[PDB]
């Protein structure tokens, strides 16, 4: 996270240490402007695929969520988990994360 040279694959690389990714049907990226503003994210599914929602693009300052992607995932999602992230800071660089 050094100025002007953020590692855009840091988390992906860490994930690839625990799992090999095989037969990926898609990998999409969505750019995010850096700020400390409250936001809302949502996810639903229909026969059309998995729908992602965010307040960021259409209502950054108010929080209403709008659709920004439909993912071609047509096998019904039944389960989810939260992937734990840990920040490999040194002691003097420790922050609190919301």
């Amino acid at each position: 996270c050094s100025d002007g040279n953020y590692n855009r694959n840091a988390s992906l690389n860490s994930f690839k240490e625990y799992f090999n990714l095989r037969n990926c049907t898609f990998m999409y990226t969505y750019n995010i402007t850096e700020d400390e503003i409250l936001e809302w994210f949502g996810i639903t599914q229909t026969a059309q695929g998995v729908h992602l929602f965010s307040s960021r693009y259409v209502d950054l300052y108010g929080g209403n969520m709008f659709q920004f992607a439909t993912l071609p995932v047509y096998d019904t999602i039944k389960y989810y988990s939260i992937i734990p992230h840990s920040i490999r800071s040194i002691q003097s660089d420790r922050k609190a994360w919301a």
Binding site: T46, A47, Q48, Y74, D75, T76
Partner: protein, 49 residues
């Protein structure tokens, strides 16, 4: 788990069968049958096709 009842699963529109995990992409021979024991978390009992 034997309980008192058994049910047949009907897919909602825009979804694959829960049995696509155990039925090959092409059936080898007419009338073949597939089974898979379920984890206690999945509900226990079996899945059958």
């Amino acid at each position: 788990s034997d309980d008192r009842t058994e049910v047949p699963q009907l897919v909602n529109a825009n979804q694959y069968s829960p049995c696509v995990s155990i039925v090959p992409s092409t059936v080898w021979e007419d009338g073949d049958y597939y089974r898979k024991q379920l984890s206690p978390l999945e509900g226990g009992g079996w899945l059958v096709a």
